[PDB]
């Protein structure tokens, strides 16, 4: 807004290049980056080992502006759901704590174009791609809130997943540098095994991803055959299951963050994809792809075309897969979470 460079938009190299233009040596960029990501600092004044002159330069041409929280919802089990303001739009960020880990689910887009029939985001349609600052800024903001204070169980973020609003492979230009910052020693310093990109299967973009970065891959499959997938996840019409699975294999040739084993996501949809015959078909489909299968007890929202699969159907589905020796997990569901308002506020201030 002020015509200043948001430093959260910049990877290590771009940061160094920017600092070079300020007439500063590359080490000063690394130093500021460290303050930004190791101490979640967005205030140049708090950077005590930087001299006043450099501080003055930075305040004039740059800022550290992460997206703000407009709604926080805290659950019993420790799960936090944030609504995040991105310009004039809203995205979602979710913190999920566990005993041995803490996972952040980060949005890649404002809305989505993929039209997955089980997805409430798909209802909105695609608005825009998120900028680097608005992706990495979700991690930054969450880490600040989780760190600031200070509750039992909620350890610092250990894992980040590109899983939320939007298809990450349709925003490669912003998703890739964001992940680079997550991975970087001077950024969040996360292992590549703990940075996971989840995709529904944009094949040429996946081929592209593997040439750009080494990060863990997860796939949103959600169906055992092409006729069912064409219906539930329309992008399958462009790139079918076999085209998707071959692209996964090509990615694993360039990348070893997965250690050969991709996580496969599968929402359970009442009488759509949750039958024993579907499970047997899934096992056959996945016989040549090393995997862990996450069966997801999906909950309907108002207007959803599908119902929840019963627990006994999910159980029988799980057992079929286990009989073939697949590592399969029924994912423990986490959390239980006006138009005239602006004019009303104006009419109130009048009194
Ligand atoms: S890719 Fe993800 S966000 Fe996009 S419509 Fe499908 S499930 Fe929804």
UniProtKB/Swiss-Prot annotation:
Alphabetical list of PROSITE patterns matching this protein: RADICAL_SAM
Reaction(s) this enzyme catalyzes, per UniProt: adenosine(2503) in 23S rRNA + 2 reduced [2Fe-2S]-[ferredoxin] + 2 S-adenosyl-L-methionine = 2-methyladenosine(2503) in 23S rRNA + 5'-deoxyadenosine + L-methionine + 2 oxidized [2Fe-2S]-[ferredoxin] + S-adenosyl-L-homocysteine; adenosine(37) in tRNA + 2 reduced [2Fe-2S]-[ferredoxin] + 2 S-adenosyl-L-methionine = 2-methyladenosine(37) in tRNA + 5'-deoxyadenosine + L-methionine + 2 oxidized [2Fe-2S]-[ferredoxin] + S-adenosyl-L-homocysteine
Keywords: 4Fe-4S, Antibiotic resistance, Cytoplasm, Disulfide bond, Iron, Iron-sulfur, Metal-binding, Methyltransferase, rRNA processing, S-adenosyl-L-methionine, Transferase, tRNA processing
Family: Belongs to the radical SAM superfamily. RlmN family.
Record's function text: Specifically methylates position 2 of adenine 2503 in 23S rRNA and position 2 of adenine 37 in tRNAs. m2A2503 modification seems to play a crucial role in the proofreading step occurring at the peptidyl transferase center and thus would serve to optimize ribosomal fidelity. Unmodified tRNA is not a suitable substrate for RlmN, which suggests that RlmN works in a late step during tRNA maturation.
Enzyme class: transferase
HAMAP family linked to this entry: RNA_methyltr_RlmN
Known outcome of mutating residue 105 to A: No change in iron-sulfur cluster content
Domain of life: Bacteria
One Gene Ontology cellular component: cytosol
Residues reported in the UniProt entry to bind S-adenosyl-L-methionine: 166-167, 198, 220-222, 299
Cofactor note: Binds 1 [4Fe-4S] cluster. The cluster is coordinated with 3 cysteines and an exchangeable S-adenosyl-L-methionine.
Residues binding [4Fe-4S] cluster, per UniProt: 112, 116, 119
Consequence of gene disruption: Cells lacking this gene lack nucleoside m2A in both rRNA and tRNAs. Inactivation of rlmN produces an error-prone phenotype since it increases the misreading of a UAG stop codon, and thus decreases translational accuracy. Also leads to increased susceptibility to tiamulin, hygromycin A and sparsomycin.
CC cofactor: [4Fe-4S] cluster
BP GO terms, sorted: response to antibiotic; rRNA base methylation; tRNA methylation
Pfam families xref list: Radical_SAM, RlmN_N
Active-site residues per Swiss-Prot or TrEMBL entry: 92 (proton acceptor)
Family annotation (PANTHER family): 23S RRNA METHYLTRANSFERASE, RADICAL SAM CORE DOMAIN-CONTAINING PROTEIN
GO molecular function: 4 iron, 4 sulfur cluster binding; metal ion binding; rRNA (adenine(2503)-C2-)-methyltransferase activity; rRNA binding; tRNA (adenine(37)-C2)-methyltransferase activity; tRNA binding
Protein name: Dual-specificity RNA methyltransferase RlmN
InterPro entries per the UniProt record, alphabetical: Aldolase_TIM (IPR013785), Methyltransferase_A (IPR040072), RlmN_N (IPR048641), RNA_MTrfase_RlmN (IPR027492), rRNA_lsu_MTrfase_RlmN/Cfr (IPR004383), rSAM (IPR007197)
Compartment annotation: Cytoplasm
Species name: Escherichia coli (strain K12)
